Amino acid sequence: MKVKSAAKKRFKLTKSGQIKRKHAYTSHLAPHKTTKQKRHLRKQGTVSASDFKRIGNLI
């Protein structure tokens, strides 16, 4: 069972589950968003427990 290549490059896995991820909406359009939105999205975050099943077996 090969690890999905386009996944292992987006979901670093921490101790005790809790898949880690970066936030979207940070690559393209600066002005359309606000400063509050931009500095809230810089900080990385965990994956919702709904997708945890879809991703754990995807790694």
Partner: protein, 148 residues
């Protein structure tokens, strides 16, 4: 123990045979539902798949690999929270080979680490010592030599 009567304690679990009638349940449909894509042979599309909707992995941005093309240089590590339970003085490779924690066919550098207090003195011969780990080892009136 009487092979004529050999018994276990408990390992023989409900074997879900899928297609042998209704009385056992799991019969004609066999648990596959009614008439969907999953019902047919080889359902269960690609593992990460939301059906056209751009999947989570495609939606999210990619982690950057700074030191590209390299491998992290591994360290053999000697934590102090456990090394107390190991009974030895004059810690080095020449004795870590004997205590089997390290292996003789391993030209690998040694690090020391850990805050937990230790009672008896130990003389370490290692490549890196933490600030407070070194402090803890010297408060035990031991010593640490930092190999170059």
């Amino acid at each position: 123990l009487n092979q004529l009567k050999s018994v276990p304690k408990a390992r023989n679990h409900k074997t879900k045979t899928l297609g042998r009638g209704h009385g056992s349940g799991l019969g004609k449909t066999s648990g596959r539902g009614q008439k969907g894509q999953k019902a047919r042979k080889s359902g269960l599309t690609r593992p990460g798949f939301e059906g056209g909707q751009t999947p989570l992995y495609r939606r999210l941005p990619k982690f950057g690999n700074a030191r590209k093309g390299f491998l992290k240089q591994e360290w053999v590590v000697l934590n102090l929270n456990k090394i107390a339970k190991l009974k030895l003085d004059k810690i080095n490779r020449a004795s870590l080979i004997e205590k089997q924690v390290i292996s003789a066919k391993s030209q690998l550098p040694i690090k020391l680490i850990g805050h937990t207090k230790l009672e008896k003195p130990l003389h370490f011969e290692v490549h890196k010592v933490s600030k407070q780990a070194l402090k803890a080892v010297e408060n035990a009136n031991g010593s640490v030599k930092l190999l170059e």
